[PDB]
């Protein structure tokens, strides 16, 4: 609900207008470069299904994680910036990211 990046973006992107979501990752890359990961390194998803893909390179990401003190309506987040490989699960035609599986 407040001024650091995660509090602002989680509210703006409608993640925390009606609940406090525990964790969420934002990727700071162009949409078409994030969509390009669906034809990069195929890997098994955490759930063992096989439609996950790992980016060849690291991407700029911000991890947002609720503090121990956060309670709706006052959601509060710790902001961690990092450059990590993302893993996304892809589906459809066009084969596009539908779930964020992890960053490594």
């Amino acid at each position: 609900s407040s001024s650091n990046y995660c509090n602002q973006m989680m509210k703006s992107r409608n993640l925390t207008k009606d609940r406090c979501k525990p964790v969420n990752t934002f990727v700071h890359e162009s949409l078409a470069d994030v969509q390009a990961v669906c034809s990069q390194k195929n890997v098994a998803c955490k759930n063992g299904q096989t439609n996950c893909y790992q980016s060849y390179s690291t991407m700029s990401i911000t991890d947002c994680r609720e503090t121990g003190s956060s309670k709706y309506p006052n959601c509060a987040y710790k902001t961690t910036q990092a450059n990590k490989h993302i893993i996304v699960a892809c589906e459809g035609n066009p084969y596009v990211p539908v779930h964020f599986d992890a960053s490594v």
């Binding site: 969420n24 990727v27 890359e29 994030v34 990211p97 539908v98 964020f100």
Partner: peptide
């Protein structure tokens, strides 16, 4: 209404 791909973009991409 919002597709799974649109929801992935809204929640995770910040170009």
């Amino acid at each position: 209404k919002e597709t799974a791909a649109a929801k992935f973009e809204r929640q995770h991409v910040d170009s």
